[PDB]
Amino acid sequence: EKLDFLGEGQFATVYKARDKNTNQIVAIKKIKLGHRSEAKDGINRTALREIKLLQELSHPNIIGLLDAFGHKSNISLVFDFMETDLEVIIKDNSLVLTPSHIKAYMLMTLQGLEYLHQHWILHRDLKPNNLLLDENGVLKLADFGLAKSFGSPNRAYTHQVVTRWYRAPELLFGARMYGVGVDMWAVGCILAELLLRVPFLPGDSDLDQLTRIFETLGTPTEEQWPDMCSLPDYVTFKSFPGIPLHHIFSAAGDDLLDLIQGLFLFNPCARITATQALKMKYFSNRPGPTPGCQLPRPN
């Protein structure tokens, strides 16, 4: 049964259609594939990663595959319905200031990241785009196709998967290995972008994002990140003085600014972990994170 078209995408098409199994309207995602190519991989590789990871993780802050149908050539995926994407709401001029709602979004993201990190899954790309908010207002990561698992035995690692607008310096420097800290850097960019309501760092690719990262935080010292010069892809930019976090984004939370600085630290080990962020004073503060019941809802 098809009730409505939730969104149009080349990779896959989203439909606001009630499930045949359940009368209540549910989010349905249908993969789009072409048999025209002489050589084909069958199910899309990104789609294959997204379906297995979604089945593996069951969490309030992680979207889950309730049911899926492979009997048809097309694959239909059943997910909890989400009222609107987070990115459109953020880019829209806020009617009021919602700092506790911003705190709630970050807390949900950290709890969801902690659950996948505990399962050992790594999310390669985190951004306001490809993020969905339900009527409940719980934050869920819509796409796990970007996410790639990492293992102790050496294996091929995807690079430049993270968005050009929000990319870790090590990924820009083409570091062979990736870490949980890279996800924290992406969360720090999202938190800074959330306060601004516009992307914190513009990325045009070709190391343009790396130049912007150097301009905002100053040039990283050799002590700040070990063997940065040793890495095969290394570029030296002009020695910018840097902008204090409370000048780029006017915000200077007593604990929020410290958390933002830890997320923006160049070294992954120095960068604050998701578990430390859960225990961070800013989250445990007199302002209370929104449960999502009072979260603003369009129409």
Partner: protein, 48 residues
């Protein structure tokens, strides 16, 4: 359960089959993280 930081003889040993590579270390692959990754999969299940 196995801690992310061993804080034990395993952390003191600091030894891996691939040992330590400077290019790999800067990107990730901390010796404690690699040991923890193997231990968590090894300790998975083991009970009914």
């Amino acid at each position: 359960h196995v801690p992310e930081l061993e804080m034990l003889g395993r952390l003191g040993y600091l030894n891996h089959v691939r040992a330590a590579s400077p290019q790999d270390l800067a990107g990730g692959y901390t010796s404690s993280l690699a040991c923890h990754r193997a231990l968590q999969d090894a300790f998975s299940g083991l009970f009914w």
